[PDB]
Design a protein around this ligand. Structure first.
Ligand SMILES: OC[C@H]1O[C@H](O[C@@H]2[C@H](O)[C@@H](O)O[C@H](CO)[C@H]2O)[C@@H](O)[C@@H](O)[C@@H]1O
Ligand SMILES: OC[C@H]1O[C@H](O[C@@H]2[C@H](O)[C@@H](O)O[C@H](CO)[C@H]2O)[C@@H](O)[C@@H](O)[C@@H]1O
Ligand SMILES: [Cl-]
Ligand SMILES: [Cl-]
Lengths: 318, 318
């Protein structure tokens, strides 16, 4: 009596005729964005569906005018009910509600509805539709992602990182001139503080990101000034949110050596690097029931990073 | 033996005449927002200054046209030089540069400039001006906050929080119905997932918040549902950023009991509260040199909080 769970929830209602179809985003996380439904006297006549990745297909044969539902980003199902045509030979009706307060009811027009089949919408995130059609919709179900435990973007790579040439802007923090007219050496302490705002951003479709809290397990591009110039590095892997902002007061204390009969001008700066480059990674969705749905993705990473505070001293003779 | 440090850095240049003035934001963290300078042949004639809290004072007696510098929020000094008039009796010239690339030079017109006094602007955040004036500016200095280690908003209170009436909006997550037409009760597993976005923000003058990374040590208002209705509570003190946003996938697994010969409607929802209320607190600035600047502040807290996921079941016959 072993028990198998799945990342998706699908209950098909109707008869056994027609030819099989599967129109879902279980390959790439795409969701149902729009649905057109044509009804007949004793069946659902046809369905045309659009997924968030641009796929568009029609099942059954349209007749007359259609009812539409357009889903907006983050709009999930709150409930779903299907009816057969009462004769066990066709789908008869579709009823659903969404988390934005929308409702949709399309039903056959001649025969009355009999047994209602209320569905578990899982997470509410609808991956699409599965069933059988021919002239009509013989049977159909809506596929849902089951209730989600975590959604992690991981195995992140930046394919062009090693070709990228860092665009570093200089930010002036402070300058001071010191003067030593004595014939002995002198030392001057200089303290520096500077707010740095580090940012990380990994692009993702608004519908997926608005529905799920995506944690990122990734290194980020980092900037540092070395001898030859500015170096970009693929940083160590850690946890981030999809959009992240970290603020800090970066500080430094410097002791400047001011030699006899010379003035030393001290220039303190920091470099701000803007990153904008493609990433690849894997979305791993872990459902509450222990199952996993995963797929490969790619998008754009945007980031702001800072170098260390840099101190530059120049000796003058006056 | 002992060494004394101060939160502020002030170096006054000029003579001993005139009457003392102090025009700074060391009481409330106000910064110099605008300065007008009138020059004469052998002195700075007058200075009018505006602080970011709206204060406005003139020192010395204006004559002729003025030069202006207007500082924008986050604009700090990078360097400053002052000159006397050469005779040690008046301020002779002011020169400064800002971290937005600005420069300002105002000087007496007839007598030549002699010894330059280059100043340490500390953090670059200018709290105002201090000196002596009568007919002219006898002497003046610009006061800076010294290089900052940490800036913390602390001892936060919400003085209206106990009077506040909960205004919780319901978000629908999931509804489903089960039918038990047998003479024995049944059990149904229902799993729920739901993204919540919790926010917190404490208002702060842009000038101060643009320049320093402000950490917040405060409790936030939180919302729960109890027997009576909704309950606002002052949460436990912890660390936040000045603007904070945290995402989480709230989850819940429920066993629904379906009594014999009954229909059970299951309604899964969550409450979202939008807090918008005043706060008081203490800004504590800790300088790199170990000194501290502290003042009471007042502002507006905004925040989005959520209740726990709520399952309501309602049983019907048939
Ligand atoms: O989807 C319904 C049905 O369509 C196809 O059968 C057709 C219909 O029954 C009707 O239009 O009459 C046609 C011929 O008289 C018939 O082909 C099949 O795909 C069928 O399997 C399906 O159930
Ligand atoms: O700020 C300079 C100077 O102003 C005041 O002195 C005045 C001026 O020297 C001049 O205008 O003549 C006036 C008349 O005798 C004189 O008051 C004083 O406040 C002085 O202390 C100050 O140094
Ligand atoms: Cl049926
Ligand atoms: Cl002088």
């Amino acid at each position: 009596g072993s028990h198998m769970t799945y990342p998706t929830n699908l209950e098909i209602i109707g008869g056994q005729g027609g030819s099989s179809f599967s129109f879902t985003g279980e390959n790439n996380g795409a969701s149902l964005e729009k649905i057109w439904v044509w009804v007949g006297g004793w069946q659902i006549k046809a369905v045309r569906a659009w997924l968030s990745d641009g796929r568009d297909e029609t099942f059954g044969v349209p007749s007359g005018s259609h009812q539409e539902y357009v889903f907006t980003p983050g709009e999930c199902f709150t409930s779903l009910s299907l009816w057969g045509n009462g004769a066990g030979t066709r789908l008869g009706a579709i009823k659903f509600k969404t988390n934005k307060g929308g409702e949709f009811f399309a039903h056959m027009t001649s025969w009355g509805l009999k047994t209602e089949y209320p569905m578990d919408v899982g997470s509410g995130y609808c991956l699409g539709i599965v069933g059988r059609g021919g002239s009509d919709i013989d049977c159909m179900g809506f596929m849902f992602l089951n209730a989600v435990q975590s959604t992690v973007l991981t195995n992140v790579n930046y394919p062009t990182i090693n070709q990228l040439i860092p665009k570093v802007a200089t930010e002036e923090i402070k300058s001071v001139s010191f003067e030593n007219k004595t014939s002995v050496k002198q030392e001057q302490k200089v303290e520096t503080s500077k707010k740095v705002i580090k940012t990380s951003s990994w692009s993702m479709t608004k519908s997926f990101s608005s529905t799920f809290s995506v944690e990122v397990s990734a290194g980020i591009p980092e900037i540092a000034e070395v001898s030859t110039g500015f170096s970009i590095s693929f940083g160590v892997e850690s946890t981030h949110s999809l959009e992240q902002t970290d603020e800090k007061n970066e500080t430094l204390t410097t002791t400047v050596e001011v030699p006899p009969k010379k003035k030393v001008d001290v220039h303190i700066t920091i470099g701000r690097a803007s990153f904008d480059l493609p990433y690849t990674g894997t979305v791993k969705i872990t459902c509450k029931n222990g199952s996993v749905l995963q797929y490969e993705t790619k998008g754009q990473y945007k980031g702001v990073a800072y170098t260390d505070i840099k101190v530059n001293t120049v000796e003058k003779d006056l």
